[PDB]
Amino acid sequence: SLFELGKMILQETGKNPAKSYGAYGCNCGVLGRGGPKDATDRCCYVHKCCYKKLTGCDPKKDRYSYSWKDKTIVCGENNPCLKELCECDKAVAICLRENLGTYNKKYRYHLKPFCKKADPC
Numbered sequence: 001s002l003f004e005l006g007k008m009i010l011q012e013t014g015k016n017p018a019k020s021y022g023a024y025g026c027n028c029g030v031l032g033r034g035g036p037k038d039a040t041d042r043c044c045y046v047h048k049c050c051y052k053k054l055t056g057c058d059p060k061k062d063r064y065s066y067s068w069k070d071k072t073i074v075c076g077e078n079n080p081c082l083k084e085l086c087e088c089d090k091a092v093a094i095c096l097r098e099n100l101g102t103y104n105k106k107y108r109y110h111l112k113p114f115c116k117k118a119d120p121c
Helices: 002-013 039-051 080-098
Strands: 066-069 072-075
Touching (some): 002 066, 039 080, 072 080
């Protein structure tokens, strides 16, 4: 769920997820997708595309279990959907950290109506 997800982002990036992400660019947050503005936004694009594969569980609500061993996110549990869901979250968290270099605070609350039509996943 958003709790695990936000904790992961915090753990990888070291940044406050709700603040730095959650309304960033055309993809990070709740307005759906759009043509990515930068690498960071591309991470959220892929993240939302990863979610379109989940069969049987809810990303926004369903909780799952993961461990933080040696500063590595580790997804672990039988439920296939949750395992998948967890891999999606882990991946964007890592993607976000890897693109910290070009994070642009000016896209932080970017007006989504200024966005272009997002290519289909």
